[PDB]
């Protein structure tokens, strides 16, 4: 099923649920952690220092049912900052598992 209108509405619902999590999820155990965030594509929880953070492929994607173990990744440095680059800024993110294509 192809609908721009339906996909935008699913994104808005994902965004609304994400905002609810960002506001209401309890703080981490420790004071060292990378901070939760909505990057417009995926919802990120607080990260554990020195760790990869994996979240499910966003379920608004028209092809989400094709990738239902796929993850998107970030890396939380040692440190409590999201791994970036920066050349330039924006955290490193791997979303290859959530891509539409075969091949």
């Amino acid at each position: 099923t192809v609908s721009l209108w339906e996909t935008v509405q699913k994104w808005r619902e994902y965004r609304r649920q994400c905002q609810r999590s960002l506001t209401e999820d309890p703080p981490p155990a420790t004071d060292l952690f990378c901070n939760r965030t909505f990057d417009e594509y995926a919802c990120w929880p607080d990260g554990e220092p020195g760790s990869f953070v994996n979240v499910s492929c966003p379920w608004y994607l028209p092809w989400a049912s094709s990738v239902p173990q796929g993850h998107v990744y970030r890396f939380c440095t040692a440190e409590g900052l999201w791994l970036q680059k920066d050349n330039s800024s924006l955290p490193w993110r791997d979303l290859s598992e959530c891509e539409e294509s075969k091949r």
Binding site: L4, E40, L95
Partner: peptide, 27 residues
């Protein structure tokens, strides 16, 4: 259908816009 195939591209463009930072920056 040309129109449905074009709507499918529009949607892929919308997803690309999100990956590029959406309402925050976006392209």
């Amino acid at each position: 259908d040309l129109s449905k195939q074009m709507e499918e591209e529009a949607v892929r463009m919308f997803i690309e816009w999100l990956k590029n930072g959406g309402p925050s920056s976006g392209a």
